Amino acid sequence: IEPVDIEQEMQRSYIDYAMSVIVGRALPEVRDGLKPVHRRVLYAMFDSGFRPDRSHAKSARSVAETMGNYHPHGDSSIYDSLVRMAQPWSLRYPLVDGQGNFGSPGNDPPAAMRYTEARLTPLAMEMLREIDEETVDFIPNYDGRVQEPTVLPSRFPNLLANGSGGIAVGMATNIPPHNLRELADAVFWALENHDADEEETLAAVMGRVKGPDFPTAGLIVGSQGTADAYKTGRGSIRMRGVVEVEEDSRGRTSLVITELPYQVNHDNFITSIAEQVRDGKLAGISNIEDQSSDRVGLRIVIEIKRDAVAKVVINNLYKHTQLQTSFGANMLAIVDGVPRTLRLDQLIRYYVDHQLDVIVRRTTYRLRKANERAHILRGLVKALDALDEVIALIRASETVDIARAGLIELLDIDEIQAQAILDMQLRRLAALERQRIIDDLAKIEAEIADLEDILAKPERQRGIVRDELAEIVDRHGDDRRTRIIAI
Amino acid sequence: IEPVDIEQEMQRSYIDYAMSVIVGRALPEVRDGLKPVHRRVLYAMFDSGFRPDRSHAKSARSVAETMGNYHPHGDSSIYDSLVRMAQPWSLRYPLVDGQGNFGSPGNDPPAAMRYTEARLTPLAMEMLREIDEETVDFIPNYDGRVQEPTVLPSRFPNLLANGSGGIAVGMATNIPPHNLRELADAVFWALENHDADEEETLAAVMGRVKGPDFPTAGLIVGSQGTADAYKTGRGSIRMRGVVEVEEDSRGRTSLVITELPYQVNHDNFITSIAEQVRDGKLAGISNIEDQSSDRVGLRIVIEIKRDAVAKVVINNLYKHTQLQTSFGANMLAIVDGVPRTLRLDQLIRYYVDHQLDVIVRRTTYRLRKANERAHILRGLVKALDALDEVIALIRASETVDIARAGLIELLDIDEIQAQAILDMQLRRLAALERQRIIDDLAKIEAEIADLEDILAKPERQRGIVRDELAEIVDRHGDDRRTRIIAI
Amino acid sequence: ALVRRKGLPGKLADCRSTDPRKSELYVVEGDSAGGSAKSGRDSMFQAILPLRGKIINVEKARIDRVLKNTEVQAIITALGTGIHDEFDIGKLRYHKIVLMADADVDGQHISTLLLTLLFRFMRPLIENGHVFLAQPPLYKLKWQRSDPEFAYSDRERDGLLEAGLKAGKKINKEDGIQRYKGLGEMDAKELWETTMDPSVRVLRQVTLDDAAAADELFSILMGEDVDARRSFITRNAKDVRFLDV
Amino acid sequence: NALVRRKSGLPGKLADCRSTDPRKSELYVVEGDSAGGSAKSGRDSMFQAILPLRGKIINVEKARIDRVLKNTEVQAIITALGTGIHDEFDIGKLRYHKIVLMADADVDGQHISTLLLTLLFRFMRPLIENGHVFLAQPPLYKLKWQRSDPEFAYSDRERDGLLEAGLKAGKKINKEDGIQRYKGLGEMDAKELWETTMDPSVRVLRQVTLDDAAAADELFSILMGEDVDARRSFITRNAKDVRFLDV
DNA sequence: TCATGAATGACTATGCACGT
DNA sequence: TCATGAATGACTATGCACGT
Ligand SMILES: O=C(O)c1cn(C2CC2)c2cc(N3CCNCC3)c(F)cc2c1=O
Ligand SMILES: O=C(O)c1cn(C2CC2)c2cc(N3CCNCC3)c(F)cc2c1=O
Ligand SMILES: [Mg+2]
Ligand SMILES: [Mg+2]
Ligand SMILES: [Mg+2]
Ligand SMILES: [Mg+2]
């Protein structure tokens, strides 16, 4: 029996927990804004073909595939993570297209795994766009049987778009979601002004990103908190719901709440005001009635007494309920395996850097693949010019190994190219088919020259990020939901 | 709003439930001895490639695949069904190779889905043998997306081997498991004596199937109950555990129970004797100690008082505990979509019929494919005999269609053969490869001759069942476990 | 008029209308379905009571054991009426009791277990036509450009498909016709536009003609006598298709 | 000294042993019901008892004492150990002279260990001082040779070593089934748990030692206490050098 | 003291037939 | 009354950091 000191054990074990939680559970990678469970679910669904071009697969299959290949944890909590990515009130831009009962903004829980179906959304398809072209580093999974992506291509700024909230050890993150169109403008500026310093970049990006854009709409009151978050990485953003005063036929007034701030449970909100009225906290209120439905959305009617002022009751609601509540912004994300609190210019810059990396790597992959195709095509063209000989040789060969070795010697060709000649079908010996091989060579060499040109010009590389992102925003960008007002 | 009478509604709804439960849930198909969920789990795993030639897949993947394509029900109860099929104390011949904690004969529950892995067993691979050769009818699944098998080939008599117990509506089944080697002998006789009447067949099969062979070993007392079950389809078979009296060093006798009858919970058994002694109903017992372990198996030590006779205490245990308990046999299975109580000669005969159907269908499929392959080969040989010409025509063609149409004219060929010539690689124009094509034609024509002979001679068909089953028994057959004694 | 909860079952999502004559109780199979129903309902007049698992057979089970069943107590408490001799229609909190179960056989089974509870404990609810059966959809045709159509049978599916194609509409052969295998697979919107919207929902009102004949059939199908039930099924299952011909 | 074991006033989850001598008795505190289940089967029921713990244990450093005593998992530990807590602690009533903590090799197992060690150090310190607390080291790999007996490895290094030696010895492994990798105790069966963690002739135990009580008191308070900042600065300061604690 | 969310599943009740 | 075995998921408690 080996002896071990409790201090050595406690320190080693707790740090091991803290670090993996920090880097590998609770906090988002800055480049794609994803935690490991998110990234692994999406890749599992992607690899399984659960894409928008096919009908929703049973969500149990997505969970099981994630479990069996990438995420060595429980099916229960994995389903919860998948479910979240499909809720329009949780994600500003949902990554999972859910079919069935995925719960509500209230206490109505989502249906069980067995009852729901799911697939990737079109925007999630942009997260994974060209992942198969060596655009991101892959590492072996938890048992080395298969490969998993270290990060996704993320062809739209997902961290800022959908935001992130996570509790780690010694620290926690809380990034709000943003409007895709505003983020795109910030990226477009960062691309054009690629030499601008942090001082200028922050000023530019802050002018284009006017503030967080919550899926639950609502209001943002003030501008200080927003500015703090972007300049410090920390800030308290004041949120509000939307209240519209209605009058009655008798002459009674009632307050109608149609929106609530981000991450406010609708049922807990109604329960809170009810408990604050019975005990005696919000006088002036006469009746609380939830007239909400699937067709009118949120609609909480607060009938007030005849001796009550509408704004007084509304101000009391702001004070004593989450009708007005603050978002504690803390811009914490993993950068190169290290947790770091970031300014808004850093969040954009780091993302832009990732996009340039993705496209240079894609170009390199395509350029390598093009040369291989060109290489084999050159071998075929040599065979066609001496076709009368090539056939005679293969025929006169006792084996295919003798036939191969002969092809190398005659036409001065590689063994890979020589193999391709052997693998050639009798179809490709037709007149027009011989011509297709010729033209295809000319086609690729033009393509190779183009690809080489991209790698040699940083201008084009930035241009591709811009142009490709622009298409995504034009297709999947939407209006702002959260309205920004002053004090 | 349409009116409906309560009698009309009650009758239609309850019968619809009863019938589906009877035919499509609770009772086994006579041909493969499987209920729908069993058949669907096994085919899901099979189609997913979860076979003994690969490492155990996470059991969640098997459930999800079963759930998502074939079995429109809950993940929880499907896992329980998969698990049971992996327990050596439940199935006489397990169909699932389980890796992890799949529970115990006692109250220790199986591990959760997330913790266990699973794959098909070699014997389960015989259940599915050549299922892809049109050996069984396939129907559309629950949403028409994919096809599922109505029944499995079942190349060993699984119903009798593994038995079946099920509660339906208006009826229930309870077929005990049997020794595979004994079942095979019965099948071998049924094949040889294929014209024998039911009177002779029942006598023959009853002599070879000596009785049930339980996975939990134990004893069978008497022969009447077994005989009743085989001749009537109903019978009460008396089971017993194994008790060994040991004499302590300090003049102390103790009963050691090392085996229990089928489906007796080890923990409930110990609890029963403990509760029947802490009051006054099993006097003579002094102490109860469970010395069981993973290494010695079951070992329940019952120390008895000195003024107590061992045989008296054992008889008292037989009477007041499940150390002696009866198996209520009720040989009920679905035959052609109809529930039927069957004699042992009927159970064998119906299985033999299924095997003959499987092999005739297999032969037909192979003969059709052989004719297709031979058909194309005939085209290739014609191309080789006029090879110098074949090349010239394809060259002068503007399209491949001009080249094809010419091949038909040259060699008098179908469109299928000519296309096969077109798809031919230069690989095969080597000397040995040209000869390989020739010999391959001769091989198939030899196979077609063989296959045609199978279809024309029922003798060979019966011979294939015998020889193929014989291989299965020699490999996967084991010793008897349940010992049969007299009164 | 009677008070709604805002002393009743915890599972009950009561309505807002305090008039039983205007109120409806949807007894739903499953928590998932009941959850989405609670969202897609008309909260003014429609209440939801989700039932979990197979209902206890009141024909077989002893009376005291039935009263201990949480799911039965939920029904009895929510309906407000008593049971047996202590039954009082005057306290009926909902004049429309809609049983909503899956189209599958287990839904059919649960229906018979509920109808058995009602017929044995609260028969007047059936006699006075307060009991209804919602017919869920089986298919959802998702046209590429046109509004989606719901079908309640294989026949209607084939018909609506034929008409649409003839009209020049088109469907994806991937997404295509979504087939419902239960209420749990539906969302709030779908349940409203097929089972809860009073202007399109297909309800069936349970009528009771011959009380004596019904009394016997309940005892045969739901009673403890298996033999009687075994022979009844083998006798009548052959002709279930031809009950309405 | 001898004490009665449960057989048809102790925790319901406890699978007690048969031996009435604490000096010869052992309590395996196991992570997870699945693992505890297999442990209950593969154990030596004569001397080894199993107490499965479910979920992350409550932090006694952060939580108030009254809340800790209401926690079902803590009550199970305290009740099973038989000793009191704090001032009413009595080693004489200790029902097991070997308290083996058995958690997954993964990061979450390490966390549970620190939560258990915190419970012990704060409520029942003498158990640590007197060497009654141990840490079982589970296997990470199982090498399944085609013809030879399977070997267990407790590290990536040992895996590579046993693989090299066996291949050098002329043995062979399937490249499919091959080396089974354990991701937790729940994936193991009864036999495997016996032949790697519970068999006293093969098990790899580590006895928790307590040298500097004052230094330990501080480290527990920093890592497990309510002060986040103190914990944050400690991690950022010392995490960089965790690899080099034993070099 | 409650919410967040990614981590560490056992327990609870019925239908159905049949034998104790 | 209990076991059988396929059928019809919600509830329950902690860690972790932070703000009302
Ligand atoms: O899938 C499963 O195994 C289960 C499904 N359900 C639900 C009904 C669909 C259950 C419901 C239970 N409750 C019934 C009502 N009273 C409380 C308990 C239950 F105890 C177990 C299960 C399952 O195991
Ligand atoms: O996978 C999951 O979601 C859960 C896993 N576990 C187990 C620990 C691995 C739970 C354990 C719970 N208990 C902890 C101990 N006291 C009783 C409750 C619990 F309430 C919920 C869960 C889960 O949701
Ligand atoms: Mg959970
Ligand atoms: Mg269950
Ligand atoms: Mg259903
Ligand atoms: Mg673990």
Side-chain angles (χ1 to χ4, degrees), chain B residues 69-337:
Chain B
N69 285 281
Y70 311 107
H71 207 55
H73 303 277
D75 59 277
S76 185
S77 83
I78 289 172
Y79 177 61
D80 295 333
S81 299
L82 175 147
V83 159
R84 186 186 176 278
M85 287 191 293
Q87 299 178 328
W89 60 91
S90 294
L91 271 66
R92 181 60 182 77
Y93 299 100
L95 303 173
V96 176
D97 182 7
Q99 176 162 114
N101 176 12
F102 279 71
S104 74
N107 283 323
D108 299 280
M113 188 173 63
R114 74 193 66 180
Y115 291 134
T116 70
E117 298 177 343
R119 65 186 179 184
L120 293 168
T121 64
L123 262 176
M125 213 57 31
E126 301 292 347
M127 288 289 297
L128 303 147
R129 181 172 175 178
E130 301 151 352
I131 196 168
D132 59 325
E133 297 191 38
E134 306 187 344
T135 53
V136 294
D137 292 335
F138 275 72
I139 56 172
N141 65 327
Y142 65 82
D143 56 18
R145 280 179 55 264
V146 301
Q147 295 279 91
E148 65 170 339
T150 60
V151 66
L152 304 190
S154 182
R155 303 310 311 282
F156 77 93
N158 181 62
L159 177 51
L160 286 167
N162 273 311
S164 183
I167 309 171
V169 183
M171 69 200 70
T173 187
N174 196 25
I175 298 163
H178 296 78
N179 183 261
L180 180 61
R181 294 173 179 164
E182 292 179 3
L183 296 177
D185 290 333
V187 168
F188 294 148
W189 187 97
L191 290 164
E192 190 104 51
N193 301 83
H194 58 269
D195 281 345
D197 61 337
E198 296 165 302
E199 176 181 350
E200 177 178 2
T201 301
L202 184 62
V205 172
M206 281 182 70
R208 289 167 171 73
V209 182
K210 295 300 191 177
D213 186 19
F214 298 110
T216 60
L219 301 174
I220 289 166
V221 181
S223 57
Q224 187 66 73
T226 303
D228 290 333
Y230 293 156
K231 298 196 302 179
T232 306
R234 180 180 301 278
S236 177
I237 301 175
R238 193 160 263 223
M239 303 180 293
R240 278 185 189 173
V242 179
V243 189
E244 296 168 4
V245 184
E246 286 184 6
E247 299 188 7
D248 189 14
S249 64
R250 293 182 183 174
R252 293 182 183 174
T253 71
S254 59
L255 315 172
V256 183
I257 300 179
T258 50
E259 303 177 13
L260 285 167
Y262 187 51
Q263 299 173 304
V264 173
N265 187 308
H266 294 6
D267 291 328
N268 298 341
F269 172 72
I270 298 168
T271 302
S272 71
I273 56 170
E275 289 181 349
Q276 266 188 343
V277 175
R278 266 170 76 161
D279 294 286
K281 291 197 184 169
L282 275 66
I285 293 176
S286 176
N287 182 28
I288 307 171
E289 194 171 25
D290 182 19
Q291 300 181 1
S292 289
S293 77
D294 178 79
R295 289 157 295 287
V296 303
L298 181 62
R299 182 181 175 76
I300 303 173
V301 175
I302 303 295
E303 186 180 5
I304 65 168
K305 304 173 185 180
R306 290 186 176 90
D307 61 322
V309 188
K311 282 182 174 175
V312 169
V313 174
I314 289 171
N315 283 327
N316 286 18
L317 285 169
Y318 289 159
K319 295 163 193 174
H320 298 289
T321 79
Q322 297 203 297
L323 178 58
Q324 179 188 261
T325 190
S326 169
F327 185 91
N330 188 32
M331 312 295 272
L332 183 69
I334 304 294
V335 185
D336 206 339

Side-chain angles (χ1 to χ4, degrees), chain A residues 257-330:
Chain A
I257 300 179
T258 49
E259 303 177 14
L260 285 168
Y262 186 51
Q263 299 173 304
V264 173
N265 187 307
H266 293 187
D267 290 328
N268 297 340
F269 173 73
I270 298 168
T271 302
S272 71
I273 57 170
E275 289 181 349
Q276 267 187 343
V277 174
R278 313 165 37 200
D279 292 339
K281 287 191 201 283
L282 300 163
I285 293 175
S286 176
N287 182 28
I288 307 172
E289 194 171 25
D290 182 18
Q291 300 181 0
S292 289
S293 77
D294 178 79
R295 289 158 296 288
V296 304
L298 180 61
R299 182 182 175 76
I300 304 173
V301 176
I302 306 295
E303 186 180 5
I304 65 169
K305 305 173 185 180
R306 293 186 177 90
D307 61 322
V309 187
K311 279 185 173 176
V312 169
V313 175
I314 289 171
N315 284 127
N316 285 18
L317 286 169
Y318 289 158
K319 295 163 193 174
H320 297 289
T321 79
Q322 297 203 296
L323 177 58
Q324 179 187 261
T325 190
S326 169
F327 185 88
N330 189 32

Side-chain angles (χ1 to χ4, degrees), chain C residues 52-63:
Chain C
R52 311 111 85 190
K54 298 288 197 188
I55 296 298
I56 184 167
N57 193 337
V58 300
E59 195 74 11
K60 289 175 176 175
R62 296 176 178 176
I63 302 97

Side-chain angles (χ1 to χ4, degrees), chain A residues 28-35 38-40 42-43 46 85 91 93-96 120-132 135-136 138 149 151-163 180 351 354-355 358 472 476:
Chain A
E29 165 66 22
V30 68
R31 290 178 290 174
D32 61 6
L34 295 182
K35 310 182 193 184
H38 306 140
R39 191 175 301 101
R40 284 170 169 165
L42 295 175
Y43 186 75
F46 178 84
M85 287 191 293
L91 272 67
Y93 299 99
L95 304 173
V96 175
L120 293 168
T121 63
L123 262 176
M125 213 57 31
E126 300 292 346
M127 288 289 297
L128 303 147
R129 180 174 173 179
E130 300 151 351
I131 196 167
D132 59 325
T135 53
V136 294
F138 274 72
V151 67
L152 304 190
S154 182
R155 303 310 311 282
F156 77 93
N158 181 61
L159 177 51
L160 287 168
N162 272 311
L180 180 61
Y351 168 74
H354 177 57
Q355 297 308 289
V358 160
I472 293 172
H476 305 106

Side-chain angles (χ1 to χ4, degrees), chain A residues 186-475:
Chain A
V187 168
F188 294 147
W189 188 97
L191 290 164
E192 189 104 51
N193 301 83
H194 59 269
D195 281 346
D197 61 337
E198 296 164 303
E199 177 181 350
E200 176 178 2
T201 301
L202 184 63
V205 171
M206 281 182 70
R208 289 167 170 73
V209 182
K210 291 299 192 177
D213 187 20
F214 299 110
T216 61
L219 301 174
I220 289 166
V221 182
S223 57
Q224 185 65 72
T226 303
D228 289 333
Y230 294 156
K231 298 194 302 179
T232 304
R234 180 183 300 277
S236 176
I237 302 174
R238 195 161 213 124
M239 304 180 293
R240 278 186 189 174
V242 179
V243 189
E244 295 168 3
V245 184
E246 285 185 6
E247 305 182 5
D248 197 345
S249 55
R250 288 182 177 268
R252 306 193 187 181
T253 58
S254 59
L255 314 172
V256 183
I257 300 179
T258 49
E259 303 177 14
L260 285 168
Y262 186 51
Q263 299 173 304
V264 173
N265 187 307
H266 293 187
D267 290 328
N268 297 340
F269 173 73
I270 298 168
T271 302
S272 71
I273 57 170
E275 289 181 349
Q276 267 187 343
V277 174
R278 313 165 37 200
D279 292 339
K281 287 191 201 283
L282 300 163
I285 293 175
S286 176
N287 182 28
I288 307 172
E289 194 171 25
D290 182 18
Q291 300 181 0
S292 289
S293 77
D294 178 79
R295 289 158 296 288
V296 304
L298 180 61
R299 182 182 175 76
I300 304 173
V301 176
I302 306 295
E303 186 180 5
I304 65 169
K305 305 173 185 180
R306 293 186 177 90
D307 61 322
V309 187
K311 279 185 173 176
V312 169
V313 175
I314 289 171
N315 284 127
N316 285 18
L317 286 169
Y318 289 158
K319 295 163 193 174
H320 297 289
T321 79
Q322 297 203 296
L323 177 58
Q324 179 187 261
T325 190
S326 169
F327 185 88
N330 189 32
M331 308 293 113
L332 184 69
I334 303 294
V335 185
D336 206 339
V338 176
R340 285 180 52 187
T341 309
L342 302 170
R343 288 177 287 99
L344 183 60
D345 72 287
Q346 299 182 289
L347 287 160
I348 294 296
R349 284 284 185 209
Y350 275 137
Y351 168 74
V352 173
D353 286 19
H354 177 57
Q355 297 308 289
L356 293 171
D357 183 40
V358 160
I359 273 163
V360 168
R361 290 178 64 149
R362 185 186 71 186
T363 305
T364 303
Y365 170 86
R366 289 182 175 177
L367 178 55
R368 177 167 61 84
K369 286 290 183 294
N371 286 316
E372 293 172 0
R373 292 175 187 177
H375 183 70
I376 287 178
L377 281 184
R378 285 184 191 94
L380 304 190
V381 173
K382 288 187 180 187
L384 297 178
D385 298 332
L387 182 55
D388 297 332
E389 302 185 313
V390 170
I391 301 171
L393 299 166
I394 297 174
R395 293 176 64 191
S397 304
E398 290 181 355
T399 71
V400 296
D401 306 88
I402 291 165
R404 192 167 52 261
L407 290 161
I408 287 96
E409 292 182 349
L410 171 59
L411 302 174
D412 191 25
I413 300 182
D414 201 338
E415 192 173 28
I416 297 90
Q417 282 167 307
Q419 192 67 263
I421 297 170
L422 286 169
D423 302 339
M424 206 192 315
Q425 291 176 306
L426 299 180
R427 274 192 173 190
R428 295 181 183 174
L429 296 182
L432 176 58
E433 294 296 344
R434 288 189 340 102
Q435 186 64 236
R436 185 168 295 167
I437 296 170
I438 300 293
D439 295 330
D440 279 17
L441 201 159
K443 281 177 180 180
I444 292 183
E445 287 185 342
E447 205 173 20
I448 294 170
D450 184 38
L451 291 169
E452 287 176 348
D453 201 42
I454 302 174
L455 295 175
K457 298 176 178 169
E459 183 63 43
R460 289 195 67 180
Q461 299 170 14
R462 291 191 300 273
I464 294 166
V465 177
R466 180 198 60 204
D467 294 328
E468 289 188 344
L469 173 56
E471 298 176 31
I472 293 172
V473 177
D474 297 344
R475 293 172 187 176

Side-chain angles (χ1 to χ4, degrees), chain C residues 29 102 104 106-107 181-182:
Chain C
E29 176 198 342
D102 296 354
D104 54 40
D106 295 279
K181 273 287 164 174

